[PDB]
Amino acid sequence: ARWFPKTLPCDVTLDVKNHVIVDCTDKHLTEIPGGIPTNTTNLTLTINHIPDISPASFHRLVHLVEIDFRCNCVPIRLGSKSNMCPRRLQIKPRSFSGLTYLKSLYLDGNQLLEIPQGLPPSLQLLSLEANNIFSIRKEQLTELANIEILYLGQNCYYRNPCYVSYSIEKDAFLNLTKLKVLSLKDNNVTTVPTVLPSTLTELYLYNNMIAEIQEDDFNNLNQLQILDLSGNCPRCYNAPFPCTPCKNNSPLQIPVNAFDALTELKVLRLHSNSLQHVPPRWFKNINNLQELDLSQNFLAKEIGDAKFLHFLPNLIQLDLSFNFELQVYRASMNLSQAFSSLKSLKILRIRGYVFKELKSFQLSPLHNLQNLEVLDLGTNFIKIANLSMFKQFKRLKVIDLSVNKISPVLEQLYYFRYDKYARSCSCYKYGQTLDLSKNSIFFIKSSDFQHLSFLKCLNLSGNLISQTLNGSEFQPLAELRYLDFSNNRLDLLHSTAFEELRKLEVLDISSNSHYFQSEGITHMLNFTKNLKVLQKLMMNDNDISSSTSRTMESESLRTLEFRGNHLDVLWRDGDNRYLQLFKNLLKLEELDISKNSLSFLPSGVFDGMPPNLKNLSLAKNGLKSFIWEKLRYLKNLETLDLSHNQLTTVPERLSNCSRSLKNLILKNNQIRSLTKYFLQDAFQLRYLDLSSNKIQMIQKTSFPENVLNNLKMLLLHHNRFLCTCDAVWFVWWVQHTEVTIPYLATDVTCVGPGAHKGQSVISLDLYTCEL
Amino acid sequence: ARWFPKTLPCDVTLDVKNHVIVDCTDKHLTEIPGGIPTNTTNLTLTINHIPDISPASFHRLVHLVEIDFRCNCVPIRLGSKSNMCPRRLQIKPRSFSGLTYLKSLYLDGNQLLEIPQGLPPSLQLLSLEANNIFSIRKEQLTELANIEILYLGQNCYYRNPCYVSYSIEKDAFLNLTKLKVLSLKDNNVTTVPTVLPSTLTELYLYNNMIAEIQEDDFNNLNQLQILDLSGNCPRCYNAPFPCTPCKNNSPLQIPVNAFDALTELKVLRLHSNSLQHVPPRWFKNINNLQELDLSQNFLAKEIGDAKFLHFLPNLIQLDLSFNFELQVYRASMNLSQAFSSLKSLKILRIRGYVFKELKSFQLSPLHNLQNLEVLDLGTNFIKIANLSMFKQFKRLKVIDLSVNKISPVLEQLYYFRYDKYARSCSCYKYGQTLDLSKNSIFFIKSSDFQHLSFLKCLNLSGNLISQTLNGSEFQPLAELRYLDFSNNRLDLLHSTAFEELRKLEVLDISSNSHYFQSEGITHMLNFTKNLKVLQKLMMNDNDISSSTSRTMESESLRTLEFRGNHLDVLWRDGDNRYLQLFKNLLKLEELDISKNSLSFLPSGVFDGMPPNLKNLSLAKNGLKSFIWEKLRYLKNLETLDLSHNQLTTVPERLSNCSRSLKNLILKNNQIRSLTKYFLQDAFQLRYLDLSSNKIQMIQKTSFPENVLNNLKMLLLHHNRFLCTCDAVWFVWWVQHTEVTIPYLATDVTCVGPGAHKGQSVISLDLYTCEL
Ligand SMILES: *[C@@H]1O[C@H](CO)[C@@H](O[C@@H]2O[C@H](CO)[C@@H](O)[C@H](O)[C@H]2NC(C)=O)[C@H](O)[C@H]1NC(C)=O
Ligand SMILES: CCCCOc1nc(N)c2[nH]c(=O)n(Cc3ccccc3)c2n1
Ligand SMILES: CCCCOc1nc(N)c2[nH]c(=O)n(Cc3ccccc3)c2n1
Ligand SMILES: *[C@@H]1O[C@H](CO)[C@@H](O)[C@H](O)[C@H]1NC(C)=O
Ligand SMILES: *[C@@H]1O[C@H](CO)[C@@H](O)[C@H](O)[C@H]1NC(C)=O
Ligand SMILES: *[C@@H]1O[C@H](CO)[C@@H](O)[C@H](O)[C@H]1NC(C)=O
Ligand SMILES: *[C@@H]1O[C@H](CO)[C@@H](O)[C@H](O)[C@H]1NC(C)=O
Ligand SMILES: *[C@@H]1O[C@H](CO)[C@@H](O)[C@H](O)[C@H]1NC(C)=O
Ligand SMILES: *[C@@H]1O[C@H](CO)[C@@H](O)[C@H](O)[C@H]1NC(C)=O
Ligand SMILES: *[C@@H]1O[C@H](CO)[C@@H](O)[C@H](O)[C@H]1NC(C)=O
Ligand SMILES: *[C@@H]1O[C@H](CO)[C@@H](O)[C@H](O)[C@H]1NC(C)=O
Ligand SMILES: *[C@@H]1O[C@H](CO)[C@@H](O)[C@H](O)[C@H]1NC(C)=O
Ligand SMILES: *[C@@H]1O[C@H](CO)[C@@H](O)[C@H](O)[C@H]1NC(C)=O
Ligand SMILES: *[C@@H]1O[C@H](CO)[C@@H](O)[C@H](O)[C@H]1NC(C)=O
């Protein structure tokens, strides 16, 4: 199709509007490549090893609005140790001054010593994170008259130290009269720099050495919407980063009138400031405040009083997590009545308060919060909770009691990680959720869930339930749609397990391997028959190698995840009792039987598949052979994943195996060559992955053009391609085709002959084959 | 050193006595190789694809006493499906008759139709398992006059069916006057063949279709020691193989006088015979009986009566496992007083009796069994057990309550597998063991172990213990040497955990990842300080990524398994706080920190290692780089396992890194070449593994002969060796060296230059490099 092969090692995209995008992210480049389109508006060269920039770099590219040149020399401790950057990035005079339309420049992570000068006046965003610029002078900032967004953080901290205090000249930023966003985080800053331009909307001063706020420090910032002063005087108990507290167990000292000017303030973040009190006076003139983070302080006592809450009626989120007093295990949670002032509250989080017994009345300040959607009391070591108290919280979307010690989405490192916003180079949607995951529930019965019939999802993942569920345990949960019972010890003695959950759409019993791992125990896998609206069943990593029932049954079920089991043993050659195990799942469209140690499939496995099977995975089975003809049985098969196996051959003619098949994944196999007519007339095919095999040669007969050209994608990388004159057609095709083939720049490569070893096939001149 | 290179693709061993052993096991052979030593006494060709035997096969090898020719054509269902055997093995006339000294012939698993004829009269052992010989005639057996051991089983069963009954001519075996061992198992046999020669010591008739024993069937077998009639009229409940019971739930019918002749019988096996009664009269004339297997019958009631036990005073092992009545959960275990008759009993196993409550008095028949060493009551769904009852079983070596449901070594498939003796082509030694693994113990306290101070090992692996152990939980266990606490949920709030176990030598707290997987929880890894005689600590797969203590401490500890954790995060670059985590384990000699996601090691890791470290593993870390010089810090290092990483290079001179190092494992890395003087003067070295890398070339400078020749082993297989004239020395060396290098037959191989692709380097003629 194409007249001129795209030889540029960067993805090029159009958009009309009106952007020409050139993305060279992570292309192992040591120079800016030649032939970048002159119309280029956005050029990305992130993660490469380009050691300098000069006026030659961008000469012809006068229409550039954005250059993203991040991480071409990242600080030693932040980057790869196998390929360390030898020397900081060199920027030569007048490299940017030509770029009359340049609006964004990202130079993060280049070990720069200074704010690059000679930048053009059209620049709105400038990002210099993770460099070694730790002294800002007014003179260096004059070029930035029209600047709106300025990221200067991570220039002096434990991952990238500068060994002195940050320095900011008096009034350095003042004459930047258009500045809206300033970030000075992770910098060893000692005082709020002043005076700052009043135009500011967002100010980020977190993770620094600021011991005191002066009452002056935010006087003029009357358009400020986000202030973050977190991690100045951090609370260091169990901190997963090196943590130095302020002397004398002191807090970040904030004058009572410090926030008076900030009438527009929407978000205030005071996490890890070692605060013992929260003075009401702080919020006297802020009534627009919507988000407040008071996590990681010493506010356990203040939670019982909290007079400041009366001043916060528009507040949408409040976080008081990890305010526990060291070495104290409270009997209960004392929430102040003041919590009842929070008319607009949607999200309340009080993780890590740390108390033994939760009781209904203790949440009564929350009863009339009409908008409350989330109550998060995770990680509290709660031992006792009458779950029925939550009958008064029907309106809530999520009740999170995750990670507690009861017996009858945020980052996994969120509250403790250093900078949760650091730049690198789920059943809630079913309705009301009670999350009881990672608790100590060993026994359940009906009354445990009394008054909880409104519940739509229940998370019991990671408890100790080790019990012969007979259909009586969950009887009140008449509206339950999703049950996560993963990481328990389900005993399937009774096929009546779970049948009381008459509205159940999704059941996860993955990682309940305990009772499947011992010989001679009963397992009623036919339990699915009773669940009339069950759509999705996950029974992964259960080590299932024996079953009392010969057949699983459902009129409703569509997806079955059966990965990480032992069908190899169930379908032991010579034993045909279980070949029809899935056949009576009549509406089953998706089946995952990857990770089942299936070296081979006995005859009968395919015949025994249910008739509407569409998406089949046999990945990661160590499969050494595959009778491809047997795909004829699966009359609606559209996706076949045979990734990560040991197949050495493809079918002689794929269209004689399956007429329906559209997506064939054969990556990470041992295929050495294709059959002479492999894809001939396979008109249904649309996605083919042959990456990470050991193919040398592809001839036209195997890959007819009329099939190839309707492929949405065709993955060929990491093979063993021989670039002799026999390869003439393949090479030509690859160079001139519109079909998307990833990694041409990077890992579609000749291994031989001699001359062309290691050379990418996109770049290959084979003119000597026509001389 | 050697004058003539060993080119035969088989391991050759001498022994004086006086055997020349040639082992060609699994060498992908399609012919018997040439040049087998004429003095060969034992030739093994197991698992190859040799399609026939003829007089040429063994012509010169007249001194052969044993031919093992197993599995060169295994039945379709038993063998590989990627390389199925096309056609049964052909044996030609007179292939064996020359072999005048032949004493053993194994022809198992070759799809033979008939007992190969023309065998020599010196033959003592003949094995024809897993063939298709399912009709034995007196005439075919006349060659075997002097035969002593005859294995004919697995010729007709579900893994290798023959579709008819087995047939044995009347008196077929009678004139084999020297026969001692006859095995007719897994054969669809319908009656005990008669008359059998009285010389028999062992008779194997298990897994067949024998409905009745005639009172005659064992009349003359007065030297018989082992009889096994198991799995005739099997009990089929939860059988993991296809299982057809005798009609009317009938048992194997055994006349009361059937065993009268068997005065020498030592072992009787009646497993899976659907027995409802055990008539005393059976044992009237057998007082030598030492082993009795009555597992998989319907003997629940009989266990309460068991009059037959009075006739068995010399019995050493008894097995009554899996005799439960279907659908019954007994309240208790009724053991007959008759159990007190068993003066010689060492081992009693009553798995799968199935009862709720175990109580002291119920074991009183066992109190005066002076020799009892093992009581196995595993897999009983016991809910309640005062563990103090075992104060009356101090003399026992093992009390096994594994796989039960309690709250406040044999095969994993042993009792249920088809043929536990099918041929394929641990803290007990510390003293008294109480195995409580895989139970439902969620809470422990002191009194749980009252009167149990004699215990030396306790297995609590795989319970639900989820508790802040403070040093009070195990207080009675004053002599305990080994605690397996693996697969629980240890909460290390307190550093006093386990301190009451003052004699503890080994602690396994592996797979207690639950509390290490959540953020902001305390973990006192310094808990080891209190354990004064602790030798070995296993804390594998705990996902440990944070720690309250900066240092682990012990004066005693020698081995620490810390595999499968997140030292990568603990030793996050820039964070120095945990670089000395193991330093104060002063006597630590072995450390495993494989599987820790260590892409690189920060500086300080090696400095912070304790001073007597000898065996260090960094396997399976994805390590991309390694400063080898830093090995100088580990002054007593002897074993370094860097297997399964991404190292691309070896040290310039290994002796400049470590003077102590003896075993260096670099297998499964990405090493493309060795340094010019790699092993120069490394006189301490003894074992070097460079297998599975991508090395092309090794020159003499890298591998000096004076280092090489003290190596006990040197692994080079699965590399990318180029066999040009530059390789002349390497090839010569490999052909003529006495140093052990495994897999020279199989996987030490040229990939090029072209001619020699796929040719083994042992066989390589490079004379053209000297022309
Ligand atoms: C933050 O600034 C302080 C100075 O305020 C740095 O601390 C100095 O570091 C050197 C070498 O580490 C010491 O010898 C000085 O005495 C330190 N001075 C003080 C006052 O502590 C600190 O390292 C800087 N932080 C970072 C991460 O670069
Ligand atoms: C040794 C197997 C006994 C019969 O099978 C079997 N399988 C299980 N999963 C349970 N759970 C379980 O509690 N039992 C005990 C039982 C036995 C009979 C009647 C009721 C309860 C189990 N028995
Ligand atoms: C979430 C912050 C609580 C402090 O750390 C922490 N870590 C643990 N592993 C436990 N186990 C545990 O039971 N607690 C609660 C506790 C707290 C103080 C005193 C006694 C008991 C824990 N607290
Ligand atoms: C192109 O640059 C403009 C200005 O920086 C930006 O708003 C737009 O999102 C960019 N598009 C990219 C990187 O694809
Ligand atoms: C249940 O909680 C677990 C463990 O905290 C989490 O992995 C999982 O996402 C939750 N399941 C659902 C369906 O939300
Ligand atoms: C289920 O078990 C509960 C108690 O464990 C019992 O009340 C109920 O009757 C049982 N149901 C059936 C159908 O056996
Ligand atoms: C399930 O398993 C078997 C039949 O295969 C039978 O014992 C049991 O009653 C069946 N129950 C249900 C609900 O299908
Ligand atoms: C060699 O064969 C003899 C006779 O069958 C046997 O007893 C001996 O175990 C064999 N030895 C080895 C090492 O294979
Ligand atoms: C055992 O014999 C019966 C008839 O006697 C036959 O139908 C059956 O197939 C045989 N079994 C096998 C496994 O060959
Ligand atoms: C268990 O039995 C012992 C006798 O050895 C007795 O001292 C103890 O009180 C019993 N404990 C319980 C909890 O039943
Ligand atoms: C404890 O029991 C488990 C089986 O439940 C086993 O794998 C482990 O090796 C046993 N521990 C010891 C120390 O023997
Ligand atoms: C362990 O570490 C803590 C400090 O992190 C200390 O309080 C405690 O006493 C130490 N315990 C032992 C047994 O060393
Ligand atoms: C080193 O450790 C491994 C197990 O971790 C062991 O198999 C090996 O024998 C040890 N080496 C020596 C020389 O003791
Ligand atoms: C390494 O070699 C150099 C030069 O031979 C020597 O000076 C140095 O001390 C050596 N280091 C060790 C650890 O042997």
mmCIF file of C-alpha atoms in Angstrom, chain B residues 238-316:
data_model
loop_
_atom_site.group_PDB
_atom_site.id
_atom_site.type_symbol
_atom_site.label_atom_id
_atom_site.label_comp_id
_atom_site.label_asym_id
_atom_site.label_seq_id
_atom_site.Cartn_x
_atom_site.Cartn_y
_atom_site.Cartn_z
ATOM 1 C CA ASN B 238 -14.347 -40.320 45.550
ATOM 2 C CA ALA B 239 -11.984 -42.657 43.660
ATOM 3 C CA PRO B 240 -9.780 -40.554 41.357
ATOM 4 C CA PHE B 241 -9.662 -43.335 38.769
ATOM 5 C CA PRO B 242 -12.470 -45.031 36.839
ATOM 6 C CA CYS B 243 -13.892 -47.542 39.301
ATOM 7 C CA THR B 244 -16.400 -50.364 38.861
ATOM 8 C CA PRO B 245 -17.643 -52.056 42.076
ATOM 9 C CA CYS B 246 -18.742 -55.712 42.338
ATOM 10 C CA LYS B 247 -22.565 -55.994 41.961
ATOM 11 C CA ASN B 248 -24.801 -55.708 45.056
ATOM 12 C CA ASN B 249 -22.113 -53.818 47.006
ATOM 13 C CA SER B 250 -20.491 -57.206 47.422
ATOM 14 C CA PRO B 251 -16.983 -57.723 48.857
ATOM 15 C CA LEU B 252 -14.090 -59.796 47.677
ATOM 16 C CA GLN B 253 -15.351 -63.158 48.966
ATOM 17 C CA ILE B 254 -12.575 -64.891 50.929
ATOM 18 C CA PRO B 255 -13.188 -68.201 52.561
ATOM 19 C CA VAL B 256 -12.282 -68.364 56.219
ATOM 20 C CA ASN B 257 -9.643 -71.043 55.530
ATOM 21 C CA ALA B 258 -8.133 -69.337 52.438
ATOM 22 C CA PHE B 259 -4.910 -68.324 54.163
ATOM 23 C CA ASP B 260 -4.301 -71.598 56.113
ATOM 24 C CA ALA B 261 -1.247 -72.648 54.122
ATOM 25 C CA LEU B 262 0.526 -69.275 54.459
ATOM 26 C CA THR B 263 2.532 -69.861 57.652
ATOM 27 C CA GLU B 264 5.295 -67.527 56.477
ATOM 28 C CA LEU B 265 2.985 -64.616 55.460
ATOM 29 C CA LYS B 266 4.529 -61.307 56.667
ATOM 30 C CA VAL B 267 2.457 -58.793 54.605
ATOM 31 C CA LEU B 268 -1.218 -59.008 53.712
ATOM 32 C CA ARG B 269 -2.846 -56.242 51.752
ATOM 33 C CA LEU B 270 -6.597 -56.045 51.528
ATOM 34 C CA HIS B 271 -7.109 -52.399 50.552
ATOM 35 C CA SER B 272 -10.254 -51.535 48.546
ATOM 36 C CA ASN B 273 -11.943 -54.887 48.707
ATOM 37 C CA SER B 274 -15.249 -53.563 50.068
ATOM 38 C CA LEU B 275 -14.902 -55.761 53.182
ATOM 39 C CA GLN B 276 -17.659 -55.431 55.790
ATOM 40 C CA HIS B 277 -16.184 -58.014 58.205
ATOM 41 C CA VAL B 278 -12.753 -59.323 59.160
ATOM 42 C CA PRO B 279 -13.241 -62.935 60.345
ATOM 43 C CA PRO B 280 -10.773 -64.011 63.065
ATOM 44 C CA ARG B 281 -10.637 -67.452 61.504
ATOM 45 C CA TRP B 282 -8.568 -65.932 58.579
ATOM 46 C CA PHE B 283 -5.544 -65.501 60.888
ATOM 47 C CA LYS B 284 -5.699 -68.831 62.848
ATOM 48 C CA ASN B 285 -2.463 -70.165 61.257
ATOM 49 C CA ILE B 286 -0.617 -66.900 60.510
ATOM 50 C CA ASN B 287 1.379 -65.723 63.518
ATOM 51 C CA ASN B 288 4.295 -64.252 61.589
ATOM 52 C CA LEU B 289 2.070 -61.402 60.252
ATOM 53 C CA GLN B 290 3.710 -58.000 60.477
ATOM 54 C CA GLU B 291 1.839 -55.749 58.028
ATOM 55 C CA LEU B 292 -1.910 -55.560 57.369
ATOM 56 C CA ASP B 293 -3.613 -53.038 55.134
ATOM 57 C CA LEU B 294 -7.380 -52.877 55.589
ATOM 58 C CA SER B 295 -7.801 -49.314 54.171
ATOM 59 C CA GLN B 296 -10.707 -48.466 51.781
ATOM 60 C CA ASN B 297 -13.200 -51.037 53.041
ATOM 61 C CA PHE B 298 -16.481 -50.701 54.947
ATOM 62 C CA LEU B 299 -15.050 -51.635 58.329
ATOM 63 C CA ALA B 300 -16.296 -48.729 60.502
ATOM 64 C CA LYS B 301 -18.394 -51.082 62.627
ATOM 65 C CA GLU B 302 -15.735 -53.767 62.687
ATOM 66 C CA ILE B 303 -13.278 -51.264 64.265
ATOM 67 C CA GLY B 304 -15.528 -51.230 67.369
ATOM 68 C CA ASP B 305 -15.380 -55.031 67.591
ATOM 69 C CA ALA B 306 -12.255 -56.308 65.811
ATOM 70 C CA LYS B 307 -12.063 -59.783 67.370
ATOM 71 C CA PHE B 308 -9.453 -60.674 64.715
ATOM 72 C CA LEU B 309 -6.801 -58.505 66.441
ATOM 73 C CA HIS B 310 -6.387 -61.086 69.239
ATOM 74 C CA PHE B 311 -4.740 -63.370 66.581
ATOM 75 C CA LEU B 312 -2.063 -60.784 65.580
ATOM 76 C CA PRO B 313 0.469 -60.309 68.411
ATOM 77 C CA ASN B 314 3.515 -59.969 66.071
ATOM 78 C CA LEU B 315 1.878 -57.246 63.929
ATOM 79 C CA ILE B 316 4.043 -54.177 63.383
#
